[PDB]
Design an enzyme around this catalytic site. Sequence first.
Site, PDB file in Angstrom:
ATOM      1  N   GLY C  29       0.783  -1.221   0.000  1.00 55.55           N
ATOM      2  CA  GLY C  29       0.000   0.000   0.000  1.00 55.55           C
ATOM      3  C   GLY C  29       0.819   1.277   0.000  1.00 55.55           C
ATOM      4  O   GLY C  29       0.263   2.375   0.048  1.00 55.55           O
ATOM      5  N   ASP C  30       2.141   1.139  -0.052  1.00 53.97           N
ATOM      6  CA  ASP C  30       3.024   2.299  -0.094  1.00 53.97           C
ATOM      7  C   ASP C  30       2.840   3.067  -1.398  1.00 53.97           C
ATOM      8  O   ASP C  30       2.870   2.482  -2.481  1.00 53.97           O
ATOM      9  CB  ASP C  30       4.485   1.873   0.067  1.00 53.97           C
ATOM     10  N   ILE C  31       2.643   4.377  -1.285  1.00 50.19           N
ATOM     11  CA  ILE C  31       2.422   5.226  -2.451  1.00 50.19           C
ATOM     12  C   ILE C  31       3.629   5.214  -3.379  1.00 50.19           C
ATOM     13  O   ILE C  31       4.767   5.362  -2.936  1.00 50.19           O
ATOM     14  CB  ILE C  31       2.116   6.679  -2.042  1.00 50.19           C
TER      15      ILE C  31
END
Lengths: 59, 565, 654
Positions: C29-31
Amino acid sequence: PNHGLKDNANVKPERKVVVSNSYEGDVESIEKFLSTFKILPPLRDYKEFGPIQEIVRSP
Amino acid sequence: NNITFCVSQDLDVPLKVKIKSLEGHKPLLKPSQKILNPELMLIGSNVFPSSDLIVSLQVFDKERNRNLTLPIYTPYIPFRNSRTWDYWLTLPIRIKQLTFSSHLRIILWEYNGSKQIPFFNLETSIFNLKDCTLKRGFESLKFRYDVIDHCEVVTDNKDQENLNKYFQGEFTRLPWLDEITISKLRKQRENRTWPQGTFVLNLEFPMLELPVVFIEREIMNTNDPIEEKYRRLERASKNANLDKQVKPDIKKRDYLNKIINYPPGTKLTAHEKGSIWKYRYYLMNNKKALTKLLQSTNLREESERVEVLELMDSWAEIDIDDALELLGSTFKNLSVRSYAVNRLKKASDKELELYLLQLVEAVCFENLSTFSDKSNSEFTIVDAVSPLAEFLIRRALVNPRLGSFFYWYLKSESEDKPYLDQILSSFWSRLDKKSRNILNDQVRLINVLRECCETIKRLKDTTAKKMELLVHLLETKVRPLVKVRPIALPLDPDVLICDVCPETSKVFKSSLSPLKITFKTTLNQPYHLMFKVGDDLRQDQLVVQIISLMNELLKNENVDLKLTP
Amino acid sequence: YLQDIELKFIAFQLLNALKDIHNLNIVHGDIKTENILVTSWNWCILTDFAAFTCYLAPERFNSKLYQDGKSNNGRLTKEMDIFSLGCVIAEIFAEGRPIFNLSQLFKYKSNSYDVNRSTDLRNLVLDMIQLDPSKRLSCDELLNKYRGIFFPDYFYTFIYDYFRNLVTMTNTCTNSTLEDNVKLLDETTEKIYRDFSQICHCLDFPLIKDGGEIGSDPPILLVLQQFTKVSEKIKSVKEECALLFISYLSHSIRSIVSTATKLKNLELLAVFAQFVSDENKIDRVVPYFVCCFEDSDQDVQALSLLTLIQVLTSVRKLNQLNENIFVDYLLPRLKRLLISNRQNTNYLRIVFANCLSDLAIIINRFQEFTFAQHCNDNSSTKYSAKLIQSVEDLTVSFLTDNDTYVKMALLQNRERTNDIILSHLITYLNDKDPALRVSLIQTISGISILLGTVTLEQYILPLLIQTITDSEELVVISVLQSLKSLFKTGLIRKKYYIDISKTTSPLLLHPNNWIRQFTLMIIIEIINKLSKAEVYCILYPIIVEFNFKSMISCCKQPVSRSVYNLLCSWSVRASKSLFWKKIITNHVDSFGNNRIEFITKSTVYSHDNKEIPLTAEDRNWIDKFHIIGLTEKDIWKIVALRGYVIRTARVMAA
């Protein structure tokens, strides 16, 4: 020998008797070389067979 | 000679080898010549040349099969005398340089016949597995066509003779019997063997001390990338080969111009610097694109400096405001300082307000000044004691007020830089007219006045007592003010001071013990002045000058913020 | 320059593996932003959780499902969002510009997009691009869908090597010296493993290493540096080999933590074996930088010369027209770097570069290849010809600078440079210029005849390889041989080598007939080499009847018939030079004596007439101290010339 005296002016290290453990590196071959020489000849003197007396003389 | 263990970098110079003896195969003339025999009709049939054995030495590198050391060869005596030399020879690779990985090699080249001289081959190891180089000691070897080597038996006895050189515990009678052991080593000549396809050689390389060997050291400095590498790649992309210079134009010229509109202190990227390098046309066109393009390239070799300095006088004259960007110590270029001095040759009244930064420039004016100092000392070696700098000198000699400003500015820099003290005398020599020098001495008395104020600050007394004492001191100072002639005012160089009112003066109650005195000018008006000592006001002074300059910048906008400078 | 075709695919593959591993770590989920991946000297991409103006990569799910903060919903995310963000980021890395825009998001809401930019790659990307959750991106499935069957395994071994790099990549946290240690260790281990790693993919039997010495042991394992060549860029890449990992390891080898760094840079120069035009340029550019870099150890010059030799072994036509003037400037840079600290030995590098002069001529031929390539078009053949001509006229100045440096190193005195001039004379074929260099070497031979006459011998022996026009100088060379007869015995053997070399190819019969008429008479010396030089007289006589009689006049062999009978003649010519050496000692003693009296009872024979009269009683007893045989009755008049020669040898002293 005079060049060895100039090298003495450069003054690298050395020891006749036991020396402290050297820093890790390629010198480990020299340390293993120090471990490649038989030792503790004197240690066999005080090891076993009791104590050691002294010499007492007379006229 | 002394034995001791000394590592590679620790050990200093290059190796050398003395070589002496061999082993006669007895199959030929004693020089190993021609393969003698009663069948010699075949020797005429085989055309067997008589070869006189000589030698050659070069080292096989690291067993990495590269080539490092030098082949070397000596003169020719009888090899039928078995060529006993003990001859030393050497090459140019130090022990510090010598890689612990390395190996000796030798080729015995005889001298045989028409276009003929023989060749034999051998190889061996340089240092010990214990890292001592051949134990820095005597040895003996054996070699065949290939895959052969040396052993120690009688060579082990000879190695014990090297243990006599290796300094096992020894005594003086032992040394005399070591002359008797010169008789014994003389007796050692009894050796016999008759091998074939291989040979032996006696070679002593006893040194004083046992070597040791390692790699060279190194320096990590300022798991990372670095600055100089990027320099390497970027400089590798800097070719610019075909010299034809096009003069193209497009809508991208506006964007490039905007790219050149960036601040002076900024550090440009690679592609931008090249884009500015191909922008030379428009760069010459726009006066604001000059300094930026100047910082867009690095001048080291004379190649770039050629076109650079050639375009220096070619390009349009830059704005004097933007000229302060290339006038910094960031660019030490001679042509840069020259051209800037030519642009700064015009000195306005704002130059007097720029004198504060000119003092900074004077502090930064020294780069490799040893040559200039020696040049001055050359003309100073005659009589006993008793560059934009020329432009500053001319500007100082021009207006006496500007000269007084330069001297006053030098008074502060005299403390930090010792050269400024003599530079003040050089400034006095820069101004021929002594008319300003008299008022400069009258203003030099102000140093003694400040010394008097410090003398008043030396004694500790009551607040009122120090006030009355400051009044008496103000009177004694009022006597000197009337005694001495008028001088230049601290507030402005134009205005001149006449005297000072003793009873109108005041005293600060602060810890700095500042003095406040109202001095009547030559305009017949009282002027209040507050002075301090025992501290550096350069901070607040430069800040005040910056406030005045900023006030001028605001006045340039035709709007006043009503700030008192 | 660091950006390449397979390079981007490699970095993207690494990112895919990292993302898949992260997906296997049950966390995501890291941008994704373009500032996430960082590069180092190892030229590897490394992504961080914090990817922080730039265009953001939105999650379609979190976007479309967002109403009033999704009714006050807490932190939420899925691997799908990371798959879409990773997708868009991957496209942004591929093109160089991203697809992120308000109109792009609106188009995503419009469920349609115009595709313009490989088939399988576009499909695999569109899988994650269309709908993250719905279209089932499945990073692992793509990882198994990786195109290259080779590239996967190669990047697997390179993943293990990346673990090694991680070992190199690894208040108080970590030591400062630990970085340098990790570096040097990473390099040594890199090579030690590069043996078997090379053996893995696209190897060769011969090499410069120990295992490479074992591999070259099968294929027959003077002194020169040579290994398996490129062979027209791996035969035009039959195995389709393109690897930037070697250049990465070289850029990592740019640093140096010990003298093992020498073998490191050498191993990089070996890694240069893969032949690529643009890559070879940067690789060779690094080498000279390394040259001018470390003045600490002299080994830097050697390693630089090695990498430069590899660059000479590259053997590729110029891709860019810049390659000419860039080489011309490359020579100048090496000249600037040629000036350095004293007592250092640049001789080997001088012999190497001089041996590479032929490669420089080959570089001129590469400029001609660029002209020929530019002549392929219409109305551009004459233009390329004139351009090559002007570039050659400009190259004449470069050749002048090179010859200047050569003459400088030759004039330098450091006798090792003189020995380095041997390979220079060997490769001198590329230089067709005047005899001025040979004249400088002749003056050098005179100054050598002053002091370094032993080295003068070895130089003169090598000087016989000149093989040049104006044979009139060969007479002065013969006079230089007569001058070589002065002192050094090595000079005698060298002059014998030159004698055989001249015996191979002759010039003038008569002059060499009288020459050899004196020389063969002086060839009666019992020295081992003197016999060899004496044997050349028969070979000379081969190249008839009038010469047979003229030679029979001075012939010392009554039974002589042919070459074999001439060997029997020389066998009957056996003599001892020991008494001749003692006689030379008597000659020097006579030189120490008084020759003032000319009484008895200048031409060529006048020297002999003055030589005989020099002594009476002393030389008689000295003649009685020898064997005094009928075979010892030989006068050996040449010993008088060698006597004045030894008198010059004594004239070099007090």
